[PDB]
Amino acid sequence: VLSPADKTNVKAAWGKVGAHAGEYGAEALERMFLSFPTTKTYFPHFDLSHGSAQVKGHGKKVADALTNAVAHVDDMPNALSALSDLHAHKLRVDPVNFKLLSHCLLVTLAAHLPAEFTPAVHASLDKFLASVSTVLTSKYR
Amino acid sequence: VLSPADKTNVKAAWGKVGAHAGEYGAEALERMFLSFPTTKTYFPHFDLSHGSAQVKGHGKKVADALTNAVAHVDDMPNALSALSDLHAHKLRVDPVNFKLLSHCLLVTLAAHLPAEFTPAVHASLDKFLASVSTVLTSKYR
Amino acid sequence: VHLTPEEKSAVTALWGKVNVDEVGGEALGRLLVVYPWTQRFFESFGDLSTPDAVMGNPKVKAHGKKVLGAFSDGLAHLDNLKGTFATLSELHCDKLHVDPENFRLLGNVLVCVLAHHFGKEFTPPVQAAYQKVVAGVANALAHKYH
Amino acid sequence: VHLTPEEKSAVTALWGKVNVDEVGGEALGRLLVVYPWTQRFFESFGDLSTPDAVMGNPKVKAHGKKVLGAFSDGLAHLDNLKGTFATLSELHCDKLHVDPENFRLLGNVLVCVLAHHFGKEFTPPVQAAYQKVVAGVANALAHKYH
Ligand code: HEM
Ligand code: HEM
Ligand code: HEM
């Protein structure tokens, strides 16, 4: 349940992302809609095209939610209580979809941080995204 | 995260199983080895045949671990801390395998309790087995 | 989907005594109740905000019977499940975009429904055989995604 | 596995500049490190109790290259991935009994390895295309289980 080493790696890899967090969330979301067209089902109201300002705005949202969990890592359930409600309870987001997003987030970090994406930080960041996802699916979980 | 209604359903469906708990664990384990022969990988040392006293002894173990979680439902992480270690950390049990077991446990309860296996208790018992499984995979999770 | 003669005897003796009106609907309902994100595909069915709503819905018990219909087809044609399901696959894959994972779920709750309605008759032999078919139909519906 | 000419240009221009000695081994290592239950299949490889053990293991970088070898085959034969993998499927399915789910994992960590070694060249177009192939090879290795 996120070891001290994991928490340290995650703070630090997040660190490097810095002000690019929002940019990265947009890229991640775009990677998912293209590779996993089944997720597109949940955003009929969006224009999913490439420079879509809907997708950019949402990437920022996703990046801020994550920075919120990193900043509150020992207390994610409480930090992300509202988002859960939304995801698990009002949008009924298939759990499968969190895996796909978490994968595309990792591919995006790997694509931006060649120095920081070691085997260990990758293991850590995988454990963090999976935690995050366990919190957001927990209304029927 | 197991609602009051869930905890109540689970206590009660477990209740009916009563002294048959060990018997049911054996049947569940046997259902899994047959339907999901890939799990058999983890028990090369066992004789998996039908009346195998290895499998019977183990069913009791699995049934007692679960009765331990039901009895300590608001505190499973602590209750099942040792088992996690074993499963997540010393046996490296593929996470996939907990889903398969949890399914076969449900098929076994459905096969024994026609009155009690309503749609709701089934939803509850699904949520309980998934929790249980989240605790036992949490050393790399 | 291979199925030996023993497995086949097992699956077929079983399926023969399945109330084709109820079992179909009980599986859809338990799917909707147990895995409540699948309701996003069935809001046109009406009131589903409790299990009793769902388990009573006329639309539900009507769509389940269709579902079983198709399972009966595949039991008929194990040697060619793609062939049998091709049309069904475009629907769920290319048009509805259901995640194939939920095909596995519906099969596994159909297996629970079977164990529930048949009790100790649904031995572990017969479950093993049935997991085969269910894996196979899930595999076929999922084709267009492959 | 269909792949349009655009996807194909994408996957092939990419694969062309892949260090076939390293990438293979880096994916196996990250699989062993990130999904540590897969080590149950690779204890004969020696010391794996840290990532540095693993990322340095000669056995690891030697088995990864074989792995990539096979991916190169399938890239060669998308029109017939079963054909290409039939022998490989009996191995992992009927003899090793690996859960097909771990085929999907190895593909997705191969995709991360690709994004890592190629940076911004590994745009989302090219990822999309690559998820196809990886889904397809995972689908083929998994055949004997279907
Ligand atoms: C790592 C997990 C993810 C995080 C951090 C996350 C975060 C968020 C946040 C913070 C918002 C806006 C919050 C608000 O305005 O109240 C949002 C909206 C939403 N999320 Fe996510 N989400 C995640 C995963 C998913 C997944 C997997 C899907 C489905 C593919 C999804 C579908 C939605 C939908 C459809 C909405 C609202 C509808 C709209 O766009 O207006 N989310 N999410
Ligand atoms: C609902 C989850 C399950 C529970 C409650 C559980 C419980 C247990 C318990 C209590 C023991 C004996 C404990 C001891 O002596 O310290 C055991 C042993 C073990 N479990 Fe499980 N287990 C579960 C899932 C799994 C799964 C999914 C597998 C893999 C298919 C598995 C593989 C093993 C192995 C191989 C051992 C020890 C080796 C031996 O049999 O001597 N377990 N488990
Ligand atoms: C074992 C797998 C499944 C089978 C055998 C199956 C089969 C069918 C059949 C018989 C129909 C009728 C099509 C027609 O009238 O021509 C249908 C419709 C539909 N299926 Fe499934 N299905 C499968 C799983 C699911 C899953 C898991 C979902 C998502 C929860 C889903 C969503 C739908 C929906 C929403 C429709 C209706 C489309 C419309 O309104 O016309 N199905 N399916």
Ligand code: HEM
């Ligand atoms: C994308 C999927 C995969 C591919 C392309 C693949 C391909 C291969 C190849 C090229 C070999 C060499 C066979 C030979 O020498 O003839 C092999 C061996 C093996 N694979 Fe994989 N494999 C896959 C995934 C995995 C996974 C996920 C596991 C489990 C973590 C696994 C476990 C093994 C093991 C243990 C061997 C060695 C058997 C022995 O010692 O001879 N493989 N695989």
